[PDB]
Design a protein around this ligand. Structure first.
Ligand SMILES: [Zn+2]
Ligand SMILES: [Zn+2]
Lengths: 93, 134, 148, 130, 77, 386
RNA sequence: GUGAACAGCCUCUAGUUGAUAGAAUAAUGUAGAUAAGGGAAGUCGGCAAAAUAGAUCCGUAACUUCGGGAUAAGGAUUGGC
RNA sequence: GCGUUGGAUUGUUCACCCACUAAUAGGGAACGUGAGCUGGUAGACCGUCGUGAGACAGGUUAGUUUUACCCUACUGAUGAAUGUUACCGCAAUAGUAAUUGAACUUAGUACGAGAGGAACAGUUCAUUCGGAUAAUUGGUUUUUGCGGCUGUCUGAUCAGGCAUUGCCGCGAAGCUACCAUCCGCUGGAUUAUGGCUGAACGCCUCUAAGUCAGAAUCCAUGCUAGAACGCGGUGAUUU
RNA sequence: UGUACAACGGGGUAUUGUAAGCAGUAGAGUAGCCGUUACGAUCUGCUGAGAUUAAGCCUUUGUUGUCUGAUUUGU
């Protein structure tokens, strides 16, 4: 009430909803949390244990990269195949 | 007066001569009659309002003890396309009605179905009698 | 601010976009546009319409289950706001999107392999079908090369 | 245009198959709606109420002719599978996958055959009384 | 109600203006002048990367003489 | 007789005559009053209107019911590339009005302003300011004499500037020219400022900044010959009335002998010159720095220009001003931004607006994606890719 | 050919392609059509418009000159293979 | 200066009834013969009268005037001639617009036995009106854009034609809605009234000479047009 | 006679809703042949495919072509 009286009256005084909050570090009082990134929302991806699940994800991806995951017909050599292809394209046109 | 807060603007859906639903078990089924409080005065224009707006009404269907009797109360659902000042347009399944005294206090004691966010914020006893907001 | 998903198209519904409908069960149905809204009104089945994501995921198009798709869980129990944790999440999201996009491209490759064999067999049947046009092709090529 | 505008108004809005699924799920829900005490306002005075097609008929024979029809079979063939909730709509987009999959396996294990047996009891009850 | 041109409301506004609003209005002027001067200095830095006696006399005397022959002059008769 | 039922007028008699404006570029009819205590400052700026868009804001408005709550709002975007100074005018006081007694131009000028002076540019020899450039010889006796004339007399000083239409995607090739007043003090210092500023540019950051209430003066979107009902707002007669129903039936019972200037007839609707005041700037964005459309809350690198560009306009490759709401004029026009003519005693002109998000979706339809990367990621790989 | 049908819609034979033309697409009109939510608050007056409409089945009140009322009313359906 | 409503009632209304509202004030420019648009002669029936034809103390019902293309006024739109052409401007004159209610706080204070219960200053939003606008929502579809449906015709498939835009669904762009959004001010002189000094009239007196405040009023700032016979400054001036 | 102008095309954006053609055994059953073949609304796959995309959308290192006709004006 009196801090209001000091700064400015009821309809002018902008209270900081912060300054009451309880944190590990106090120097970060005037920070902001990002809400939206490219398409996603931060609140959905934000867990305390995300770096470990990301480590597991990277382990899995590196296993697949070593595996065969990211990787002519007999009778016709290659130019025969191209000849057949161009003849068929000509026929359709 | 009776309401807590300012005259805020949300689109109009309910002109005079509109029968809307009551789902509480005070006894009524329907609400019709004329009047809207805080309505303007313009030639040829209908009194029509919402925003948890208070209106005069009669029971067209219900118990005879409260038929034939004019009464005030408040819109809680509209079914027109209203805009929230926080993003999206809202609209309900239907119109809904329900009953009170001029101070905003209800004749009934509980509400069925959803009630509008701004209607409950404007009328306290609706928020106490409502179990379902939005 | 939030980014909701259309009840029909499973598409993002940004602020100031779309319409919301509030059923009597106190349940919200928000749509990306009047197309999906009107389909809902007409009581169409989005699992039968080919331009949704539900049809795709149910049919076996672009994949439904993966480790990449578990991170966007909704969270009803919050945390103390560590900005270090925020910064880690910001990089994590970008990395996860690359990984998911690569796996999606791989799924599409797995689906669309076996098409060039079919196309080649089509062309083989056609050319072995229709030789009488190949004579017109031969004579016209010869005429042109003798012309030039 | 006029057909869609004047059929699918929110005034003339019907009862959202999700809820019909949740109603045909359990015993007490189906028995309540089969009992349905005498209401002066309802078309059939309560009784003769189809739950799949959430509709009050006048009489038992009007129920018979409704059940011997493609309008009933449309709904029963629509209501066999899962009901397409927002859970499905967001799991498609990559959002609350595990909730959707738990719901799916829950229906596949528990709720599915529950509702199927309830429907079969409903059908032989109606065919026996009618 | 009290109109826009009501003396009391205008006096209240007059009392408010000299205070919290004119300070905010005057700070912006100093800020924008400080920006205006730098937008000159940067242009200079980029540059350093490399009677009225002619015709007014005749035209005016001719106009005055046309005016004095046609008698179409405002001051002269 | 006494009409039996009072009702307000239909239309405003101050916005008359409802005729076509005499110029596409509306003319500024009043600049703020000068205070000779304060630094030298431009009173106005020029810009080109480029569509509209939508933003979300975090509102610290005490007393309101969105205090500490989020609010979606429309905004207008004006392409405001830097403005070039080319001249000075001095306006002496008289007991008839204000009179211009001399105008001084710069040494070198651009093909744009020369095109403005010309009307068939592709045939001319382009001989516009040759003798003036010659008058800019060794000492510039004439130039200095007229400048000293302006310092001595003339009372108030305006500056002739032009735009850099070359920078916009607009297909016009011809710049606009405008007098913009200098509102600092010391006429000598005004003239010195202009003398030093010839052939040099003034950006919009050097005339405006955030949280400022500005006025837009423009011309409003001609629709053509229109009738009573849509041009004044009258009722419609019920149906199949005689000689039609989209008009005023009559004047009543009583008998005049003339038709008045007050009885709401047909004619031109639009292309009127309008002055709409008190629009709050939300962003002064710059082309040099990408991520204009991004925000402290978003951190999603993108410029304000939506996917597929604006409609009937291109991309914003230049400095821009974002204001809230609806200004007069349509896209691809010339608007003048003036600053407010009076100190505003509303807290609206004090609140430091903070944005959370800007909509960069397509306006060529129902836009669902802010970026083509988002579109790519959602749609997934197509047939054409691989 | 559809269909109960010399109805309405398309076509074969035979006949015609005649009625001052061209360019734009302002208002007001003439002839039509659609419209959120509310649904007769309009107006002297529901004028006009809308809605209903074919065929199969169920079912059908008062009154009655016993012949009717009656397609009373009110309800379930209609494709393709 | 600004506003002064929505409806019920035709066995009728030279009016009344209940509601909303800040309020629901009265009148004129027609009715000082007769003048927008809309309700309130010919045929027929009942009643009174009449020998009768018919009339009426009545009552009921049905029942074709059709400008403006002329002058003026009004609204918008061009335009000759004042060395030519072009650009930037001034502002005489004319018009002018904003309005009302509620809410926080002041304060459960002043005031009051109690019951009850204000206001200035500081703030927020809405009603009526006006002017713009199209980011979003909704509407609109000859984009005849996409798809589908009935009947028929082109031998079937494909691709199409016809059904006075054939019908159904979605439908961008454009237009558009307090059905969407935005915006809408500040100086001087005054009325009533309250006063200062002060005679008339050896007291006294707001007044007689002088003089301070003061109303949504007046005049201006601001907004709109710009005198086509009002004006200025400025650029080029013909192989 | 130029980062000139236009007609085409390319890219992006948006609207619609998965083209023509070919194949399968997925297909209520019916016939023939000693389980198998023919018919078969429809379903599945190549296929968010195919079509349209300025006429008052954005963009363009492409191809092709075009750029001195008429009249009038003096302080
Ligand atoms: Zn959708
Ligand atoms: Zn059913």
């Amino acid at each position: 009430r009196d801090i209001e009286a000091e700064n400015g009256g009821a309809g002018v005084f902008n209270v900081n909803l912060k300054d009451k909050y309880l944190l590990e570090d106090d120097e970060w009082k005037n920070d902001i949390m990002p809400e939206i990134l490219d398409g996603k929302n931060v609140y959905d991806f934000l867990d305390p244990e995300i770096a470990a699940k990301l480590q597991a994800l990277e382990e899995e991806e590196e296993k697949l990269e070593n595996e065969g995951f990211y990787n002519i017909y007999d009778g016709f050599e290659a130019s025969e195949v191209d000849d057949i292809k161009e003849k068929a394209a000509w026929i359709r046109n | 007066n009776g309401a807590q807060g300012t005259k805020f603007r949300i689109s109009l859906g309910l002109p005079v001569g509109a029968i809307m639903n009551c789902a509480d078990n005070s006894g009524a089924r329907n609400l019709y009659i004329i009047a809207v409080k805080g309505s303007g005065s313009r030639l040829n224009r209908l009194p029509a309002a919402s925003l948890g707006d208070m209106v005069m009404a009669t029971v067209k269907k219900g118990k005879p003890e409260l038929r034939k009797k004019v009464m005030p109360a408040i819109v809680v659902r509209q079914a027109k396309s209203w805009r929230r000042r926080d993003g999206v347009f809202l609209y309900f399944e239907d119109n809904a009605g329900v009953i009170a005294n001029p101070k905003g206090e209800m004749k009934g004691s509980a509400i069925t179905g959803p009630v509008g966010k701004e209607c409950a914020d404007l009328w306290p006893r609706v928020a106490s009698n409502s179990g379902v907001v939005v | 601010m939030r980014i909701y998903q259309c009840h029909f198209c499973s598409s993002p519904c940004y602020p100031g976009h779309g319409i919301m409908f509030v059923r009597n069960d106190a349940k919200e149905f928000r749509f990306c546009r009047s197309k999906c809204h009107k389909a809902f009104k007409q009581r169409r089945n989005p699992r039968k319409l080919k331009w949704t994501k539900a049809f795709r995921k149910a049919a076996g198009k672009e994949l439904a289950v993966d480790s990449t798709l578990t991170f966007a869980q909704r969270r009803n129990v919050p945390v103390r706001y560590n900005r270090e944790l925020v910064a880690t999440t910001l990089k994590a999201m970008a990395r996860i999107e690359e990984i998911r996009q690569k796996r999606e491209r791989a799924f599409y490759k797995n689906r669309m392999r076996g098409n060039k064999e079919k196309d080649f067999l089509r062309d083989k049947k056609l050319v072995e079908s229709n030789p009488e046009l190949l004579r017109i092709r031969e004579v016209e090529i010869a005429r042109k090369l003798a012309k030039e | 245009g006029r057909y869609s505008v004047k059929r699918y108004k929110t005034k003339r809005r019907t009862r959202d198959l999700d809820l019909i699924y949740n109603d045909l799920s359990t015993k007490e829900s189906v028995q309540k709606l089969l009992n349905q005490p005498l209401d002066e306002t309802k078309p059939g005075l309560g009784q003769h109420y189809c739950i799949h097609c959430a509709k009050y008929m006048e009489t038992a024979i009007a129920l018979k002719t409704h059940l011997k029809g493609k309008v009933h079979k449309r709904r029963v063939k629509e209501l066999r599978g899962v009901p397409y909730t927002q859970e499905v709509s967001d799991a498609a987009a990559g959002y609350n996958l595990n909730k959707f999959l738990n719901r799916v396996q829950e229906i596949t294990q528990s709720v599915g055959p529950e509702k199927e047996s309830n429907e079969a009891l409903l059908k032989e009850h109606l065919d026996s009384t009618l | 109600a009290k109109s826009l041109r009501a003396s009391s409301h205008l006096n209240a506004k007059s009392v408010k203006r000299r205070g919290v609003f004119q300070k905010a209005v005057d700070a912006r002027e100093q800020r924008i002048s400080d920006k205006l001067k730098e937008d000159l200095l940067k242009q200079k830095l980029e540059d350093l990367k490399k009677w009225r006696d002619g015709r007014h006399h005749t035209y005016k005397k001719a106009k005055l003489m046309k005016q004095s022959k046609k008698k179409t002059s405002f001051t002269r008769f | 007789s006494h009409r039996k039922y009072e009702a307000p007028r239909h239309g405003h008699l101050g916005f008359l005559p409802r005729k076509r404006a005499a110029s596409i570029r509306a003319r500024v009819k009043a600049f703020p009053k000068d205070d000779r205590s304060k630094p030298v400052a431009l009173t106005s700026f020029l810009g080109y209107k480029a569509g509209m868009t939508t933003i979300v804001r975090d509102l610290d408005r005490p007393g309101s019911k969105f205090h500490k709550r989020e609010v979606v709002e429309a905004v207008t975007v004006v392409d405001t590339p830097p403005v070039v100074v080319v001249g000075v005018v001095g306006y002496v006081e008289t007991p008839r009005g204000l009179r211009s007694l001399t105008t001084v131009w710069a040494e070198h000028l651009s093909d744009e302003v020369k095109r403005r002076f010309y009307k068939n540019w592709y045939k001319s020899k382009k001989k516009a300011f040759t003798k003036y450039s010659a008058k800019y010889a060794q000492d510039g006796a004439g130039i200095e004499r007229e400048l000293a004339r302006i310092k001595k007399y003339a009372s108030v000083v305006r500056v002739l500037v032009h735009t850099q239409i070359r920078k916009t995607p607009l297909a016009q090739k011809k710049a606009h020219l405008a007098e913009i007043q200098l509102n600092g003090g010391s006429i000598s210092e005004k003239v010195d400022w202009a003398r030093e500023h010839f052939e040099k540019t003034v950006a919009v950051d050097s005339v405006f900044e955030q949280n400022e209430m500005i006025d837009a003066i423009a011309v409003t979107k001609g629709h053509g010959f229109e009738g009573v009902t849509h041009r004044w707002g009258t009722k419609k007669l019920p149906r199949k009335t005689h000689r039609g129903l989209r008009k005023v039936a009559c004047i009543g019972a009583w008998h005049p002998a003339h038709v008045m200037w007050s009885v709401a007839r047909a004619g031109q609707r639009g292309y009127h010159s309008r002055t709409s005041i008190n629009h709050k700037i939300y962003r002064v964005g710059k082309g040099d720095d990408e991520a204009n459309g991004a925000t402290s809350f978003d951190r999603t690198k993108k410029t304000i220009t939506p996917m597929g560009g604006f409609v009937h306009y291109g991309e914003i490759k230049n400095d821009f001003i974002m204001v809230k709401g609806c200004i007069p004029g349509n896209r691809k026009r010339i608007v003048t931004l003036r600053k407010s003519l009076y100190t505003n005693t509303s807290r609206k002109a004090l609140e430091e607006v903070s944005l959370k998000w800007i909509d960069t979706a397509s306006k060529f339809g129902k836009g669902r994606f802010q970026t083509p990367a988002e579109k790519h990621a959602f749609m997934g790989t197509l047939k054409k890719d691989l």
